[PDB]
């Protein structure tokens, strides 16, 4: 029923091992008419947020382990241009948040 908060999404991921249904990847959003320069996601895909893309971790800012990969999701998105809030979650269920567009991270699960 639009789950887009840090706790809501984190607890959903832990329980169901997937993002809630209001999440679409960037390429899926594009297929629906999203253009980042227009800030139009809420108009072309009402109620949806960007999430599920691979998060590279190439800079090692998040902890690394053999066979661990990471994905990201937008948090608190309502409309217009994307914001600064993200959840980043690993394949072994570590969950980190950022509220400054990936400058700093805090573990929440």
Active site residue 34: no
User: Largest Cα–Cα distance of the chain, in whole Å?
Assistant: 41
User: How was this one solved?
Assistant: X-ray
Which of 10, 72, 89, 96 is an active site residue? 72
**Residue 69 near residue 91, CB atoms below 8 Å:** yes
Tell me the CA distances in angstroms from 61 to 15, 18, 43, 65, 93, one per residue in order.
26, 23, 34, 13, 17
Structure's resolution in angstroms: 1.6
Q: How far apart are the first and last CA of the chain?
A: 22
Sheet of strand 70-74: strand arrangement? 23-24, 49-54, 70-74, 86-90, 95-98, 106-107
Tell me the CA distances in angstroms from 91 to 33, 68, 69, 96, one per residue in order.
30, 6, 6, 12
Active site residue 101: yes
CATH number of 1-109: 3.10.450.30
Which of 18, 38, 68, 101 is an active site residue? 101
């Amino acid at each position: 029923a639009v789950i887009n908060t840090f706790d809501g999404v984190a607890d959903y991921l832990i329980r169901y091992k997937r993002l809630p249904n209001d999440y679409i990847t960037k390429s899926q959003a594009s297929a629906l008419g999203w253009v980042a320069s227009k800030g139009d996601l809420a108009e072309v895909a009402p109620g949806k947020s960007i999430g599920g893309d691979v998060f590279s971790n190439r800079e090692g800012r998040l902890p690394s382990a053999g066979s661990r990969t990471w994905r990201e999701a937008d948090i608190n998105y309502v409309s217009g241009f994307r914001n600064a809030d993200r959840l980043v979650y690993s394949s072994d269920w570590l969950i980190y948040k950022t509220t400054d567009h990936y400058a700093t991270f805090t573990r929440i699960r």
